[PDB]
Design a protein around this ligand. Structure first.
Ligand SMILES: *[C@@H]1O[C@H](CO[C@@H]2O[C@@H](C)[C@@H](O)[C@@H](O)[C@@H]2O)[C@@H](O[C@@H]2O[C@H](CO)[C@@H](O[C@@H]3O[C@H](CO[C@H]4O[C@H](CO)[C@@H](O)[C@H](O)[C@@H]4O[C@@H]4O[C@H](CO)[C@@H](O[C@@H]5O[C@H](CO)[C@H](O)[C@H](O)[C@H]5O)[C@H](O)[C@H]4NC(C)=O)[C@@H](O)[C@H](O[C@H]4O[C@H](CO)[C@@H](O[C@@H]5O[C@H](CO)[C@@H](O[C@@H]6O[C@H](CO)[C@H](O)[C@H](O)[C@H]6O)[C@H](O)[C@H]5NC(C)=O)[C@H](O)[C@@H]4O[C@@H]4O[C@H](CO)[C@@H](O)[C@H](O)[C@H]4NC(C)=O)[C@@H]3O)[C@H](O)[C@H]2NC(C)=O)[C@H](O)[C@H]1NC(C)=O
Ligand SMILES: *[C@@H]1O[C@H](CO)[C@@H](O[C@@H]2O[C@H](CO)[C@@H](O[C@@H]3O[C@H](CO[C@H]4O[C@H](CO)[C@@H](O)[C@H](O[C@H]5O[C@H](CO)[C@@H](O)[C@H](O)[C@@H]5O)[C@@H]4O)[C@@H](O)[C@H](O[C@H]4O[C@H](CO)[C@@H](O)[C@H](O)[C@@H]4O[C@H]4O[C@H](CO)[C@@H](O)[C@H](O)[C@@H]4O)[C@@H]3O)[C@H](O)[C@H]2NC(C)=O)[C@H](O)[C@H]1NC(C)=O
Ligand SMILES: *[C@@H]1O[C@H](CO)[C@@H](O[C@@H]2O[C@H](CO)[C@@H](O[C@@H]3O[C@H](CO[C@H]4O[C@H](CO)[C@@H](O)[C@H](O)[C@@H]4O)[C@@H](O)[C@H](O[C@H]4O[C@H](CO)[C@@H](O)[C@H](O)[C@@H]4O)[C@@H]3O)[C@H](O)[C@H]2NC(C)=O)[C@H](O)[C@H]1NC(C)=O
Ligand SMILES: *[C@@H]1O[C@H](CO)[C@@H](O[C@@H]2O[C@H](CO)[C@@H](O[C@@H]3O[C@H](CO[C@H]4O[C@H](CO)[C@@H](O)[C@H](O)[C@@H]4O)[C@@H](O)[C@H](O[C@H]4O[C@H](CO)[C@@H](O)[C@H](O)[C@@H]4O)[C@@H]3O)[C@H](O)[C@H]2NC(C)=O)[C@H](O)[C@H]1NC(C)=O
Ligand SMILES: *[C@@H]1O[C@H](CO)[C@@H](O[C@@H]2O[C@H](CO)[C@@H](O[C@@H]3O[C@H](CO[C@H]4O[C@H](CO)[C@@H](O)[C@H](O)[C@@H]4O)[C@@H](O)[C@H](O[C@H]4O[C@H](CO)[C@@H](O)[C@H](O)[C@@H]4O)[C@@H]3O)[C@H](O)[C@H]2NC(C)=O)[C@H](O)[C@H]1NC(C)=O
Ligand SMILES: *[C@@H]1O[C@H](CO)[C@@H](O[C@@H]2O[C@H](CO)[C@@H](O)[C@H](O)[C@H]2NC(C)=O)[C@H](O)[C@H]1NC(C)=O
Ligand SMILES: *[C@@H]1O[C@H](CO)[C@@H](O[C@@H]2O[C@H](CO)[C@@H](O)[C@H](O)[C@H]2NC(C)=O)[C@H](O)[C@H]1NC(C)=O
Ligand SMILES: *[C@@H]1O[C@H](CO)[C@@H](O[C@@H]2O[C@H](CO)[C@@H](O)[C@H](O)[C@H]2NC(C)=O)[C@H](O)[C@H]1NC(C)=O
Ligand SMILES: *[C@@H]1O[C@H](CO)[C@@H](O[C@@H]2O[C@H](CO)[C@@H](O)[C@H](O)[C@H]2NC(C)=O)[C@H](O)[C@H]1NC(C)=O
Ligand SMILES: *[C@@H]1O[C@H](CO)[C@@H](O[C@@H]2O[C@H](CO)[C@@H](O)[C@H](O)[C@H]2NC(C)=O)[C@H](O)[C@H]1NC(C)=O
Ligand SMILES: *[C@@H]1O[C@H](CO[C@@H]2O[C@@H](C)[C@@H](O)[C@@H](O)[C@@H]2O)[C@@H](O)[C@H](O)[C@H]1NC(C)=O
Ligand SMILES: *[C@@H]1O[C@H](CO[C@@H]2O[C@@H](C)[C@@H](O)[C@@H](O)[C@@H]2O)[C@@H](O)[C@H](O)[C@H]1NC(C)=O
Ligand SMILES: *[C@@H]1O[C@H](CO[C@@H]2O[C@@H](C)[C@@H](O)[C@@H](O)[C@@H]2O)[C@@H](O)[C@H](O)[C@H]1NC(C)=O
Ligand SMILES: *[C@@H]1O[C@H](CO)[C@@H](O)[C@H](O)[C@H]1NC(C)=O
Lengths: 126, 116, 450, 126, 126, 48
């Protein structure tokens, strides 16, 4: 099933994981008044790459999905699994967590790949 | 080619003052220092000062200071120089000469005078 | 195990020196100054409310102010930013007209100022306009009955009238570095701008820097720490200008003590020339005052900093400028919109051995301006209404030495400069640019899989 | 401990490996005179991506750290492990190796991923 | 052997796999009339990154080579292995497949990483 | 094919009176107009 770009917006978050290949696919799209379009298409890569950085500096860089050894503080919208993916869309969901997002990432970048990848060397040096 | 072309020779009474014109050509006028030098007959060379043609900065020796007035007409690309209070000792053949490189360079204006 | 391999490292603290295009910043409050683009700030990016600065420990970086490209990038900016402002304004090429000038109405005791009648054009292409204005003598030159005149530029350079809406007032500008580059702030107190720096910290943006355009005297600028620092790329070379930074500011009070009428003359459609009507009342000449005390106080604080470079016991003399254009021979600055030029002979008329009132400086105002000397193009600054007054912290100096003369007896010094790059160095001495090299390769006992 | 951006510059190289998540994080940062800023921010991605290429064409692309099967010629600053990481900062270190850097990379790109990844197929084809 | 950039063009496709580190290496290369060069170098990253996206949204992102669990429809130029790599250059080869390329990718992006990476979570959640 | 994708269970808050799209366009028509005016004939000699 292909509902098109951003079809699963009003879908519950679980139904929206089927569409990551759709939203991520068209995220890049391959004088005077010519300026108008030019500075525009630049923001697309400035925008796209800042995630690749985040995705990259974390245990991912491998797009779509990727897990992490960072736990979940219940101080960030303590909910049941079904109460989230099954009962919430992403918009409803992303609306809540936007408080601790920056607090979340400081772990994934520093607590994880800054720390976990070095342990890999400490294990791989022998 | 560049060309330093000076004024005609002049025959003057003592006590007076005298200017010399020296019109440049063939290079960026305002970018190059200009020295003035007299050479008394059979004698050595007396460095009389210099001008930077940008806004007209100058610097004379202690000997020649007071008597020397050195200028340039960026519009017309003419350097002027005036020794004043002329004495019989102030009889010489007076030159203008340009340093090797433009003012942007290091150690200009003290390198060496090329066009004469 | 014991043998060494290679292992890549992303994000190592490694930088190399390089130059790149920077960009500006001037707060968000100066953005509200508007008044139809005052001076510069327009697309100038706002400032970080917390200008975060990161000290760098065991970091020793070699700074140079005299070669710092940041001075040239800025220098070319002020120039180009200025032409953009000049472009939309009124071309005064119809003013290049023979001028019937009479000296100004005073009871003898002599003019500098001319009451010049002349024919002008109107918005109607055939009808013409018998008008008169006042001009300072430095803007006109006579041309050979009473004497006729003409603007001094008319024969060399085209002339345009600065838009009356734009202001020439300086605004603090923070220069900034993009990602992959960053700025280094040399923080040690007594620092001669050349050589390495003990305390090095990084900022992404310089502080607020007001592009003050002034000759001889520096105004409204940065002060030094502890002793007054004296920096010159080379002192043995007397030709190398010497830049001074104060620890203490010197107040100066400058006025145009003349209540000024401004007539707006219609040459249009859309083209309008702002002339000068009468001065209202007493005719006084512009001047600046300086506390003769604190002035002479600062002369001594300096002269004691000079013998550090010349003799334990020696003589030091001050003289006025030897010669040059008006911009160099006198002190150029824009006060209140008018452009002032003040005789500083009374400041540099002193002599110093090993061991209450105020001065006043006669000033001159010009309106037709060719600043940066670029022939072909001159700017006519419109007049400012009423009496002008402004006050500035004197914060630095540009000086030239003398020559061989007598060997070690005494040395003389005079004002000078006139290249605005040196005005920019006064603020960028502690700054320099670098590019990062985050990829690191080094040996270790690690090895990837098979 | 977070010393900020480039805090570990004068730190010995070993202490600086704690800060890779810091220097790599802000390496991207999300008319007339507008030109001034525009061409600037472009060099940031031109600069950033050329590493991603190098990092990518080698056995990495996974940011921060990553090992390699390329050995170490003692003709490149033959030193002891401690004499480098413990006694040298990165600046002191990077100052030396800048001679053979280009000679080093020609291995990582060609001797490694050009060669080692194909062996992977030769092993994975059955 | 280093034949330079694009040396293996007229080479059979198998000989050209030796040169991936060469063609991929220089694929990025680190007023008026200045415009001319500027918009040019931007297309380089717009061009380069659209592959990184494709390479990334598929099971790759790891450059040069990478395999996939997507089969091969014989309706796409049914040939023998040797008839392709050994007897064809890439130009001869790429000339044929250009019909179903878009049909091929819709699998790698959707059938694979959209589907296979989630199974990874379903396996890694316990 | 101006492809359009309906969004289900999607409820978005629209405003026309604050929509910046109006200002971006508004400034475009103006500036586009001066570019057209620039190469043409200045009638300042007609002020007669
Ligand atoms: C530079 O600059 C300058 C400056 O200027 C200024 O400034 C500027 C900036 C601006 O602001 C301006 O505006 C100013 O002005 C310039 O110079 C100048 O100046 C001056 C100043 O003041 C000015 O003058 C003014 O003017 C005005 C006008 O007047 C006129 O007009 C009117 C009308 O409006 C009239 O009324 C009058 O009169 C006048 O004139 C006239 O005209 C007519 C016509 O044209 C004529 O007729 C004729 O005639 C003949 C025969 O004769 C024939 O026929 C012919 O055709 C005809 O046409 C007549 O004549 C005439 N008149 C005469 C007289 O003559 C007015 O407003 C004013 O005035 C007023 O005030 C005053 C007071 O303040 C008065 O009185 C006066 O006073 C005095 C003293 O104080 C006097 O003086 C004297 O004189 C004698 C002789 O005479 C001697 O010298 C002595 O020593 C002296 O001291 C005078 O004179 C008187 N005046 C007369 C006029 O008279 C007056 O008046 C008035 O007032 C009123 O009056 C009445 C009677 O009349 C009474 O009753 C009442 O009360 C009263 N009121 C009050 C409130 O006060 C004045 O004057 C002028 O304009 C000017 N100019 C110009 C051009 O602009 C210059 O220019 C420059 N430069 C260059 C190069 O750029
Ligand atoms: C070294 O630094 C010092 C300090 O930084 C500088 O000293 C400055 O000197 C300049 C002149 O060179 C002075 O500028 C003029 O000052 C006028 C006084 O304004 C104050 O009073 C009025 C009335 O009480 C208030 O409205 C003003 O408030 C404004 O500013 C504050 C911030 O301080 C804002 O919060 C407000 O919103 C206002 O914007 C001040 O308190 C001032 O009139 C004048 O500005 C007029 O003139 C210019 C052209 O000359 C016009 O572009 C502008 O629009 C203004 O025109 C209005 O006013 C005039 C009357 O003045 C009328 O004719 C017009 O119709 C119109 O209404 C100008 O700013 C300045 O005060 C002084 N101080 C500072 C802090 O800058 C030195 O110059 C400097 N040296 C060098 C070499 O750079
Ligand atoms: C703006 O521009 C105007 C026009 O250029 C200038 O005014 C003219 O100036 C000239 C020069 O002086 C004047 O010429 C003089 O004209 C007299 C004859 O004029 C008669 O006819 C005119 C019409 O053509 C009438 O308006 C006038 O009333 C007269 O009936 C002569 O008398 C003059 O020559 C004699 O006098 C002078 C001294 O005044 C002597 O030097 C001469 O040798 C000679 O003996 C003279 O030629 C002219 O009349 C003016 N007006 C016009 C053309 O209307 C303005 O000065 C100028 N203003 C500026 C530049 O500020
Ligand atoms: C302006 O900037 C210049 C440099 O840019 C500085 O000038 C230096 O000044 C000193 C003193 O005048 C000079 O040093 C002397 O030079 C002698 C020979 O010079 C040769 O060798 C040097 C290498 O040292 C080369 O750079 C140079 O090109 C020449 O080939 C040496 O023999 C001297 O050493 C001995 O003499 C002096 C006293 O004579 C003693 O103090 C020393 O201890 C020692 O016994 C001496 O080094 C130097 O050459 C100049 N450098 C250059 C490059 O020209 C100015 O100092 C600077 N101005 C200020 C105010 O800082
Ligand atoms: C920058 O600043 C310097 C210094 O302030 C100025 O230099 C001055 O220049 C003027 C102009 O020449 C000099 O003024 C001269 O002063 C004499 C004073 O007259 C009376 O005053 C004293 C005592 O008060 C009495 O002893 C004296 O007898 C007088 O009663 C006048 O004598 C001079 O004018 C007369 O002489 C000259 C010939 O020399 C004649 O041509 C004149 O017509 C007139 O008869 C004269 O005015 C002043 O002395 C200078 N001072 C210094 C220190 O140099 C610069 O001018 C100034 N530059 C700029 C660009 O602003
Ligand atoms: C929008 O929400 C509705 C209601 O939750 C969803 O419709 C349900 O779909 C499931 C699965 O097919 C059915 O079992 C329910 O009976 C449906 N209920 C209703 C009221 O429609 C719908 O699928 C959602 N769609 C999106 C795109 O979010
Ligand atoms: C400025 O001061 C610095 C030190 O702060 C001086 O740098 C020295 O320069 C010489 C070369 O002439 C080096 O060999 C020395 O090692 C430097 N010293 C230090 C402590 O770094 C520099 O000479 C001074 N320059 C001026 C013009 O005063
Ligand atoms: C320049 O002017 C300033 C203010 O216009 C003067 O400072 C004031 O001086 C008066 C006396 O004239 C004192 O009563 C004030 O307290 C001072 N105010 C401030 C804020 O300093 C200054 O003295 C003048 N300087 C000169 C050299 O004339
Ligand atoms: C800068 O160098 C100094 C000296 O090597 C370091 O300070 C040492 O730190 C260690 C670890 O805490 C102590 O055991 C030593 O006693 C310290 N010695 C001295 C002389 O300070 C310092 O940590 C270094 N800092 C950076 C940022 O490089
Ligand atoms: C171009 O094609 C020719 C012919 O297929 C190739 O030359 C052959 O190379 C192999 C391997 O060295 C030899 O065994 C054959 O005898 C050669 N035959 C001929 C006719 O040359 C050549 O290598 C190809 N080169 C490229 C770059 O594609
Ligand atoms: C984990 O959460 C802790 C508790 O946060 C506090 O309590 C919750 C319920 C909210 O009210 C929140 O605003 C309070 O601050 C934090 O103290 C702790 O730092 C958190 N840890 C991380 C890594 O975020
Ligand atoms: C490994 O190093 C070999 C030796 O290099 C030579 O000797 C050293 C000590 C230096 O003086 C160096 O400049 C000399 O060239 C090289 O011959 C050999 O190519 C190197 N191998 C690689 C892969 O770099
Ligand atoms: C696999 O191929 C099937 C057959 O394609 C049809 O037959 C071949 C020989 C060609 O003539 C072709 O144009 C025809 O459409 C397709 O029906 C099927 O969709 C293909 N599957 C995929 C995933 O591409
Ligand atoms: C100048 O300053 C000195 C201090 O160095 C002071 O003793 C002297 O009185 C001052 N002289 C004048 C004329 O102001």
């Amino acid at each position: 099933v292909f509902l098109g770009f951003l079809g699963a917006a009003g879908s519950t978050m679980g139904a929206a994981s089927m569409t990551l290949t759709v939203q991520a696919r068209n995220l890049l799209s391959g004088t005077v008044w010519g300026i108008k379009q030019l500075q525009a298409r630049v923001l697309a890569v400035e925008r796209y790459l800042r995630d690749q950085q985040l995705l990259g500096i974390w245990g991912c860089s491998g797009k779509l999905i990727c897990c992490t050894n960072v736990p979940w503080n219940s101080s960030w919208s303590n909910r049941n699994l079904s109460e989230i993916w099954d009962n919430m869309t992403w918009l409803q969901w992303d609306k809540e967590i936007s408080n601790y997002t920056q607090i979340i990432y400081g772990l994934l970048e520093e607590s994880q790949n800054q720390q976990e990848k070095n342990e890999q060397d400490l294990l791989a040096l022998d | 080619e560049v060309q330093l072309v000076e004024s005609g020779a002049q025959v003057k009474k003592p006590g007076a003052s005298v200017t010399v014109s020296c019109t440049a050509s063939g290079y960026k006028f305002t970018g190059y220092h200009m020295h003035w030098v007299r050479q008394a007959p059979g004698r050595g060379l007396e460095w009389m000062g210099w001008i930077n043609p940008f806004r007209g900065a100058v610097k004379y020796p202690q000997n020649f200071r007071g008597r020397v007035s050195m200028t340039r007409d960026t519009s017309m690309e003419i350097f002027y120089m005036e020794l004043s209070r002329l004495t019989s000792d102030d009889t010489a053949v007076y030159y203008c000469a340009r340093e090797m490189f433009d003012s942007s360079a290091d150690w200009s204006p003290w390198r060496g005078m090329v066009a004469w | 195990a014991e043998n060494l391999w290679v292992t890549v490292y992303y994000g190592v603290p490694v930088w190399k020196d390089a130059e790149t295009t920077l960009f500006c910043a001037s707060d968000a409050k100066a953005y509200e100054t508007e008044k139809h683009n005052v001076w510069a700030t327009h697309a100038c990016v706002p400032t970080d409310p917390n200008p975060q600065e990161i000290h760098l420990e065991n970091v020793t970086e070699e700074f140079n102010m005299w070669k710092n490209n940041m001075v040239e990038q800025m220098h070319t900016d002020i120039i180009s930013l200025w032409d953009q402002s000049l472009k939309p304004c009124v071309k005064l090429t119809p003013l290049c007209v023979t001028l019937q000038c009479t000296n100004v109405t005073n009871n003898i005791t002599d003019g500098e100022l001319k009451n010049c009648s002349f024919n002008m054009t109107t918005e109607l292409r055939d009808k013409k306009q018998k008008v008169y204005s006042l001009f300072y003598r430095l803007d006109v030159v006579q041309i050979n009955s009473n004497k006729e005149y003409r603007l001094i530029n008319c024969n060399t350079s085209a002339i345009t009238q600065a838009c009356p809406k734009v202001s020439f007032e300086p605004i603090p500008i923070h220069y900034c570095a993009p990602a992959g580059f960053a700025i280094l702030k040399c923080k040690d107190k007594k620092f001669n701008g050349t050589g390495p720096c003990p305390s090095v910290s990084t900022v992404q943006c310089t502080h607020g820097i007001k592009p003050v355009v002034s000759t001889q005297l520096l105004l409204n600028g940065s002060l030094a720490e502890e002793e007054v620092m004296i920096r010159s790329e080379n002192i043995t070379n007397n030709a190398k200008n010497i830049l001074v930074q104060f620890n203490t500011p010197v107040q100066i009070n400058c006025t145009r003590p003349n209540n000024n009428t401004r007539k707006s003359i219609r040459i249009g459609p859309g083209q309008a020339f702002y002339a000068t009507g009468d001065i209202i009342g007493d005719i006084r000449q512009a001047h600046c005052n300086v506390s003769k005390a604190t002035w002479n106080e600062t002369l001594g604080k300096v002269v004691k900093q000079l013998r550090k470079h010349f003799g334990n016991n020696t003589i030091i003399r001050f003289a006025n400028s030897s010669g040059g254009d008006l911009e160099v021979t006198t002190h150029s600055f824009n006060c209140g919109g008018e452009f002032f030029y003040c005789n500083t002979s009374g400041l540099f008329n002193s002599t110093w051995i090993s061991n209450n009132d105020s001065i006043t400086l006669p000033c001159r105002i010009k309106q037709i301006i060719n600043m940066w000397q670029r022939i072909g193009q001159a700017m006519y600054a419109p007049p400012i209404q009423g009496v002008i007054r402004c006050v500035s912290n004197i914060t630095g100096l540009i000086l030239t030495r003398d020559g061989g003369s007598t060997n070690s007896t005494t040395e003389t010094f005079r004002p000078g400069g006139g290249d605005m790059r040196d005005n920019w160095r006064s603020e960028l001495y502690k700054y320099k640019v670098v590019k990062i090299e985050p990829l690191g390769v080094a040996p270790t006992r690690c090895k990837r899989r098979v």
